[PDB]
Amino acid sequence: KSLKILFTALFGPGHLNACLGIGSLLRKRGHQIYFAHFPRHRATIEKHGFLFISLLDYAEPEFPIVDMLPDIGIIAKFAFERMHKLTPLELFRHASGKHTFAGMVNGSKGENYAMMKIVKEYKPDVCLADYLFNMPWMFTVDCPVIPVKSVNPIELYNGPPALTGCSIHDPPSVREEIEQLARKSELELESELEKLFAHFNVPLVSYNYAQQLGIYIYPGPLDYKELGSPKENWVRLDSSIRSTEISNFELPEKLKDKPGKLIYVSMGSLASAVTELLTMILTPLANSPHRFIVSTGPNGDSIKLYDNMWGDKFINQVALLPKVDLFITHGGSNSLIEGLTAGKPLIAIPQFGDQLDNAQRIADLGLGVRLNLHEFSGEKLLKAIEDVLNDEKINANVARVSEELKKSDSKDKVISLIEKLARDKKL
Template sequence: MPSYRFLVTAIDAYGHINAALGFAEGLKAAGHEVYFAHHEKHRHLAVKRGFSFIPFPKTLSVADMGQAMNYWIALCGDEIRQEPLKRYLTMSVFERESLAGSVLYFTPLNNALNDIVNDENYKFDGIVGDLTAPFPFLYKNSIPWFPLTSLNPLVLYPKGPPPSSGYSVNSDPSNWDEFREAYAKAHAKITEATNACLDAAGLPNVRYNSARFVDNPQTVGFYHYPADLDYTECEPKEPNWHRVDAWVRQPDLDTEFVIPEKLQDKPGKVIYFSLGSIGSADLVIMKKLIAILAKSPHKFIISKGPRGDELELADNMWGENYVNQVAVVQKADLVITHGGNNTFMETLYYGKPMIVIPYFYDQFDNAQRVIDKKIGFRLNPYQIDEDYLLDCIEKIFNDKEMLDRVKAISHNMRTSNSFSEAIKMIEKHIEQSKSKL
């Protein structure tokens, strides 16, 4: 099989960047040449993995996401800490307009990627992107492109519960339409704004769907979820999307994680706690959870997040604002997580049970899947019960059947050939495309 040159990119959000990097590792391992295009601040992530790096132009503004999240949570924290249906029914005009404002980044990013694709110095054979919306540059170039979705795959199952609802597949379907309507209304402005950009680009037949956050594949697209948890009971799924059981990225740092000296002589299991880059910026929730976990007989590795300097940890805890998560998860006995899909997949890949405290969007769906498949517990950020959380920790460590289920999922993810098959599918489509020239 010949070696091809790929452009790999993602929207500017760590979950999507990490997913794109993990998939790109598979392309490189198969002998292909990978160019990762993104903001200069992410160069080290590409270089560490042996990818070539293409920086976006400096004129492409980079928002201070930390400050933006702090501002958003300060203004909308009480709205965010609600169950999903109520949140979307009561979403403020400010938040709706803020979502729509993110579209200001859409056209400049599209233009930057279009310039890269058309640069004669590169001559890419394929494009792989975790972009969450249809981008005109993909449609206006002849290079084969392959979308990724690093989200919970409910977005690909129209007959399943509404994405981002956190509803069980076993829940009453008569309630689903109310959620869909509330969600659509809350996201109407961003949907209209994005579709206006597509109209302006001369693509009136290409539409953005805020409930799905994915593009329709030109040929094939790939989503990241283990076969044991996939929503087969909700089939059929959207056409041309193929599951990959695991494309978990390598750790961002080469050094092995060692349990800090502060915790080495302390009793109990090792528990990793992270609410992701967004959830951890909510100090109301972080402080409350840290106070509860301080009463546990176990020891905790804490990813403190962008406002970590404002957090005080207990004696049974060690943490930093950023930790080398993939390496930490491997040393943990349990993971308490927001349920973001990357952390969710990493936790399962390394065979760890979890407690999911979802903060927004598909995190609620992953949290409910944990319950439906009996591999952990769900605790909602708007209803944190101290006794329940501490009890869940102990129940997990004493539930051999649950631990065995998680280990079986891990084994199946590690032995699956779905990732190598995905790479072969991409190679085949590129080969067919070239044969038509």
């Protein structure tokens, strides 16, 4: 029998895209998928075969939601400016106890009221949600709720703090200070969540507690097994995709008479809006003896492309990846999953938050290299390209991860868990 399954997520693209992927798996099993989100994303939600519900239509009168949503361009632009100038340690020092995302908590009241109302009216059999932190509605509504995590999952472990980008190789003296500061700023997240939960009269829980079941999307071969097991009830989905080798993608004519390998460059939609970022990256690449495909982003028309480069604002990344030799990425989890599923090595240039942890994971596991904005040079980037392209160890590690991701039956397992919880109200 076919279930009513309700998804929601934060406004941002990582969170929306993680739910779309799981929803596609469930739709294939015959379930009716609803997605409560924002009207800007209706088209993609409906194109995926889901039923769109606007969060904004279920708002309490005092909390219309849109008023408190964050200024995403302001944040990204500020993030770039700091990452360009400051080391991660300096970043955490300059932050002065202010957490990466605790500032978003206060403004999330409206989305909470809206979800309480949606769940009550639509009466799904189960809900899934991709947020940065737990919300009170997840503990008040009258159905099981599954948090979905797409960010780097180190936060699920009793280990080094998330968001620092610390390496497994950093000795005590190197990591001590940034890890103290990261833990100090986490106290602001907790204090902010206290107020939100108090407002809704719900007992406070950890920001990533899963009451019955949580799903984190991350490849098994990169997962933090050296930290033991993730927190109670969290289960790994290795990916929501299967490996595809046949593609519609064709080489742009512009690149036909140009030497070298084929390299894909994408900083993701948020970071790419800061045109200075792509300009800094691409300028030196005019002299790299290779062919580049560039995702130029929302402000793509003002990005200068050289003779060895072809760009478009809308690249189909999964169609392209099987045909390239290297992926220069911001380190978002979905991009990493897509790159490794296609068996391609990575150069990660992290921009914000958990991407630092992903970038360092790539380096630590020999799947590519991390390059940091704060010490960026054309010389360094060009060398990183030559090194990764010709490193037979890196290319073999990536081939091994790609092969394991095929072998996954984590999809079957996770689907079965979702369906069991929906039907039985318990696992």
